[PDB]
Design a binder for these strands. Structure first.
Lengths: 83, 78, 80
DNA sequence: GTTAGGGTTAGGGTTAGGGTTAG
DNA sequence: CTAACCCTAACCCTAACCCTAAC
């Protein structure tokens, strides 16, 4: 009935993924335990799947790599290669 | 910049009717080594999407009823 | 754990094991695992890795709709 | 120790949409 | 003004992985 939608990441969503990444690393299921639906801490990531979390973290890692900037510690173990 | 041939345009319309805005699938059928033709072999996936959107914006700008094979094609007027 | 794609040698060994003893993963490693009776072509794959590879094969067939080989009819796996 | 099955994740590939450009 | 283009961030597919429990 309409083109398939894409859902821009809000600032609250982005801040929640950064905190989850800094606490448990690239453990996407655990991050949603902390911040997903019925999350122990918050529910700010309740509208994102595990794969959505990983695709966003990868996009962040690619941004630092593309610009030559130092990787934040919480993105070192995130998947993503310049080529 | 390469203008679109009539055969290219017909192939894209055929792919959109069959698989909708599945750009990679359309090039499976009409792209390089396509299973049906090779009429779209010189167009990337983003080129296909951009051509279909070009078409959709033409209908939206003129009030003409949108063809069914463009409903799910991306494109909004300012 | 570092992920390692399956070579052709490993897949052929797993296929032959399924044909001979079915989804008896420990027995397949008796034939092709460490100190295997036939080869050591699967020496770097655990029993669970064999099960998971065979299930990935069965799932492909269930998705493609093409007929699955008989050596997969007893392999675990169902589209959801 | 064996194994079925549900759950998890890395990586390649795909695609919606805003913005730019050549004519 | 627009048909053709580029850049970005969001999205899908699946092969290879882990967890758990029944026996």
């Amino acid at each position: 009935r309409k083109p398939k939608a894409k859902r821009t990441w809000s600032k609250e969503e982005e801040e929640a993924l950064v905190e989850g990444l800094k606490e448990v690393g690239p453990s996407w299921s655990k991050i949603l335990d902390l911040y997903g639906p019925g999350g122990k801490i918050t529910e700010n990531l309740k509208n994102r799947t595990q794969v959505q979390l990983k695709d966003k973290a990868r996009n962040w890692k690619l941004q630092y790599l593309k610009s030559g900037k130092p990787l934040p510690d919480y993105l070192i173990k995130v998947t993503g290669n310049l080529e």
